[PDB]
Write a protein that binds this ligand. Sequence first.
Ligand SMILES: OC[C@H]1O[C@H](OC[C@H]2O[C@H](O[C@]3(CO)O[C@H](CO)[C@@H](O)[C@@H]3O)[C@H](O)[C@@H](O)[C@@H]2O)[C@H](O)[C@@H](O)[C@H]1O
Ligand SMILES: [Ca+2]
Ligand SMILES: [Ca+2]
Ligand SMILES: [Ca+2]
Ligand SMILES: [Ca+2]
Ligand SMILES: [Ca+2]
Ligand SMILES: [Ca+2]
Ligand SMILES: [Ca+2]
Ligand SMILES: [Ca+2]
Ligand SMILES: [Ca+2]
Ligand SMILES: [Ca+2]
Ligand SMILES: [Ca+2]
Ligand SMILES: [Ca+2]
Ligand SMILES: [Ca+2]
Ligand SMILES: [Ca+2]
Ligand SMILES: [Ca+2]
Ligand SMILES: [Ca+2]
Ligand SMILES: [Ca+2]
Ligand SMILES: [Ca+2]
Ligand SMILES: [Ca+2]
Ligand SMILES: [Ca+2]
Ligand SMILES: [Ca+2]
Ligand SMILES: [Ca+2]
Ligand SMILES: [Ca+2]
Ligand SMILES: [Ca+2]
Ligand SMILES: [Ca+2]
Ligand SMILES: [Ca+2]
Ligand SMILES: [Ca+2]
Ligand SMILES: [Ca+2]
Ligand SMILES: [Ca+2]
Ligand SMILES: [Ca+2]
Ligand SMILES: [Ca+2]
Ligand SMILES: [Ca+2]
Ligand SMILES: [Ca+2]
Ligand SMILES: [Ca+2]
Ligand SMILES: [Ca+2]
Ligand SMILES: [Ca+2]
Ligand SMILES: [Ca+2]
Ligand SMILES: [Ca+2]
Ligand SMILES: [Ca+2]
Ligand SMILES: [Ca+2]
Ligand SMILES: [Ca+2]
Ligand SMILES: [Ca+2]
Ligand SMILES: [Ca+2]
Ligand SMILES: [Ca+2]
Ligand SMILES: [Ca+2]
Ligand SMILES: [Ca+2]
Ligand SMILES: [Ca+2]
Ligand SMILES: [Ca+2]
Length: 669
Amino acid sequence: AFETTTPPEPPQFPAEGKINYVARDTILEFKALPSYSEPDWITEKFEKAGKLPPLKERLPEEPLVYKTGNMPDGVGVYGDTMRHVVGGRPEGWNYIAGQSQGWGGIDIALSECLTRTAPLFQVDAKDTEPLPNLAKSWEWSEDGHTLTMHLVKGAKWSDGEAFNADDVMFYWEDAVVDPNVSPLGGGASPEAFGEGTTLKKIDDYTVEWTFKAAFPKQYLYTMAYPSFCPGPSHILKPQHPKYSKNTYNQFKNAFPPEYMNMPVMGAWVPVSYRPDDLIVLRRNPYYWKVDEKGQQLPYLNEVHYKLSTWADRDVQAVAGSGDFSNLEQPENFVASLKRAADPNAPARLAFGPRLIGYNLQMNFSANGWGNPDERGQAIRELNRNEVFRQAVTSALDRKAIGDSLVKGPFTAIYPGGISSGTSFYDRASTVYYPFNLEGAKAALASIGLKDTDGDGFLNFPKETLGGRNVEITLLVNNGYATDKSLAEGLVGQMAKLGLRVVIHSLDSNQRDAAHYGGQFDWLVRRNSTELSSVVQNTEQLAPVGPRTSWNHRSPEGKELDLMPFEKEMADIVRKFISSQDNAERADLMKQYQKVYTQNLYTIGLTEYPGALIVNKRFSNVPQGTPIFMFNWAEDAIIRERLWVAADKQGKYELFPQQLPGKPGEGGPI
Ligand SMILES: OC[C@H]1O[C@H](OC[C@H]2O[C@H](O[C@]3(CO)O[C@H](CO)[C@@H](O)[C@@H]3O)[C@H](O)[C@@H](O)[C@@H]2O)[C@H](O)[C@@H](O)[C@H]1O
Ligand SMILES: [Ca+2]
Ligand SMILES: [Ca+2]
Ligand SMILES: [Ca+2]
Ligand SMILES: [Ca+2]
Ligand SMILES: [Ca+2]
Ligand SMILES: [Ca+2]
Ligand SMILES: [Ca+2]
Ligand SMILES: [Ca+2]
Ligand SMILES: [Ca+2]
Ligand SMILES: [Ca+2]
Ligand SMILES: [Ca+2]
Ligand SMILES: [Ca+2]
Ligand SMILES: [Ca+2]
Ligand SMILES: [Ca+2]
Ligand SMILES: [Ca+2]
Ligand SMILES: [Ca+2]
Ligand SMILES: [Ca+2]
Ligand SMILES: [Ca+2]
Ligand SMILES: [Ca+2]
Ligand SMILES: [Ca+2]
Ligand SMILES: [Ca+2]
Ligand SMILES: [Ca+2]
Ligand SMILES: [Ca+2]
Ligand SMILES: [Ca+2]
Ligand SMILES: [Ca+2]
Ligand SMILES: [Ca+2]
Ligand SMILES: [Ca+2]
Ligand SMILES: [Ca+2]
Ligand SMILES: [Ca+2]
Ligand SMILES: [Ca+2]
Ligand SMILES: [Ca+2]
Ligand SMILES: [Ca+2]
Ligand SMILES: [Ca+2]
Ligand SMILES: [Ca+2]
Ligand SMILES: [Ca+2]
Ligand SMILES: [Ca+2]
Ligand SMILES: [Ca+2]
Ligand SMILES: [Ca+2]
Ligand SMILES: [Ca+2]
Ligand SMILES: [Ca+2]
Ligand SMILES: [Ca+2]
Ligand SMILES: [Ca+2]
Ligand SMILES: [Ca+2]
Ligand SMILES: [Ca+2]
Ligand SMILES: [Ca+2]
Ligand SMILES: [Ca+2]
Ligand SMILES: [Ca+2]
Ligand SMILES: [Ca+2]
């Protein structure tokens, strides 16, 4: 019915990075050093005064050592604060039970994971093994069904309690496996680690994975942020319903934002919270990472998270009051570029490849996900109809969508699927449905949708919902001008096609609950890592498990109502996960792209590049860091390795020469 082609090549984007490509093992290694050091005030006021054990006793026998060769500016010096600005708000500290701490890097810094992938933008390959983090090493069995994983040994939580296999086991059994606990991010279901996957404790520093498939090496990426980042089991386990009288909601909410010094494996500990104002973190004296000179990380003593808006983060970063931003909203591009064009500018700004994409996602569950009413059920049936999807995508004037955000070479025609900025992308495999409003109108008439009351809006046939007007709800994230502008643009374009679309605008926390609970017809969403990188959270590319897909999940308790193209996509993704053949993997992503875009698994709105904004006083910021690839730039830049030269340091510490207090107690000690 439609004359499909490939999407047109966008304008050339001059100077992205450039990235200084390195080999995987140039960044870090685990080893003992001859001696260790720390800020002088810790030795004088805490160690010598009895208050803390000497540094060597606090560290693992073999800490994680950052290699000097990979440091952009070399070994650092202690001091200063990194000031972040966020549009989110904390719910509390229970990350593994699905509570947000405010986004914008806070949970990334607090909740460290088994592996780490964000700094891998500097390795020029897509078969890179994730960096060891809380898991120091691992080995595959000969048959590839068993993965023996060795943990960092001798590391402690920020309160001095030992980190070991008990924390790993508690997260796996009582958060992942437990169907009443869902970690933050919408992922981390048991099937995200493979169907029938088991994890068992061997000893205090050894765990063992058992996989149905042979060598599913892709799951090492799933073990990084956000899906395998354990909480302090000694604090959380006594609050869990399996070991107490608490309900699941009581367990989820047992650590509100007012609860101080929540134990972490991260470089800084939350010490202060003021509603709608600020979160202050102070250096963790038990941090288990050091530089090659034996200096215990982080270099920065303090981190701030100013509670504001996402657009204010850009404003503060270019003004110099904020130290970091991911410039990701096109309506802020011109003003940010103008302010950064001044040679006296306090911050540096650098655009990367086109990795920020937006999709229209349709709820594909016709078997009760989100318990829809008669109206909602009739929309699910239209969403599952391929002619309806072809009409919706063909009624979009993608050039006009791009123009509505920003002029210039930023936007690209985006039909959906894998981002054009990543190496697995193939233009020839991308099905583009050009703007054909007349063809879209004929396609809807062919499935029995026609305006029977002269109001310009299409009615269902008399057999469905008494022949009333089709009414579609659109779930939108209220925190971003981009999301809201795209939603408004979509409503106008659908009105021309004859479909009535109603915006349901919600704040982040409520938006995530409505989405993951399946309480939506359609939604507007910025793409997560699987479309920007393929290799990070690959399970999110298709409904490989009952809850791995963003738009097709099963209600509890029920199975998936997969359409044939979705089963073909699930098969491609599972084959990719267990393949170590580069040529086969590239071919599988071409087939994946083709099936996705031909069948309209989602409908692309637009795609463009973002820019990293960092205050100039910071040393060790890697060149060409993208804002979003394997993770957000807050992770990729390795904040625990950043430093400021003594003569350039700001004097912004709110708790200078202080360390975190005890969990559930007072302010910094
Ligand atoms: O956390 C660092 C990040 O914070 C801000 O974005 C947070 C954003 O996260 C969620 O949105 C996405 C995109 O749809 O969903 C995946 C998984 O949760 C995230 O990777 C991705 O951002 C929430 O659904 C949003 O409500 C929430 O605001 C900020 O925009 C980023 O630049 C970066 O600082
Ligand atoms: Ca284009
Ligand atoms: Ca390498
Ligand atoms: Ca090499
Ligand atoms: Ca000192
Ligand atoms: Ca001893
Ligand atoms: Ca080196
Ligand atoms: Ca050096
Ligand atoms: Ca200091
Ligand atoms: Ca400071
Ligand atoms: Ca931020
Ligand atoms: Ca074997
Ligand atoms: Ca040890
Ligand atoms: Ca000990
Ligand atoms: Ca845990
Ligand atoms: Ca679970
Ligand atoms: Ca198990
Ligand atoms: Ca098997
Ligand atoms: Ca313990
Ligand atoms: Ca109980
Ligand atoms: Ca309960
Ligand atoms: Ca409950
Ligand atoms: Ca709950
Ligand atoms: Ca309750
Ligand atoms: Ca709470
Ligand atoms: Ca914690
Ligand atoms: Ca607040
Ligand atoms: Ca207040
Ligand atoms: Ca106030
Ligand atoms: Ca030194
Ligand atoms: Ca505000
Ligand atoms: Ca915008
Ligand atoms: Ca520019
Ligand atoms: Ca994106
Ligand atoms: Ca169909
Ligand atoms: Ca344009
Ligand atoms: Ca233009
Ligand atoms: Ca465009
Ligand atoms: Ca291509
Ligand atoms: Ca009508
Ligand atoms: Ca009709
Ligand atoms: Ca538009
Ligand atoms: Ca199922
Ligand atoms: Ca299947
Ligand atoms: Ca590969
Ligand atoms: Ca510098
Ligand atoms: Ca560099
Ligand atoms: Ca300040
Ligand atoms: Ca407290």
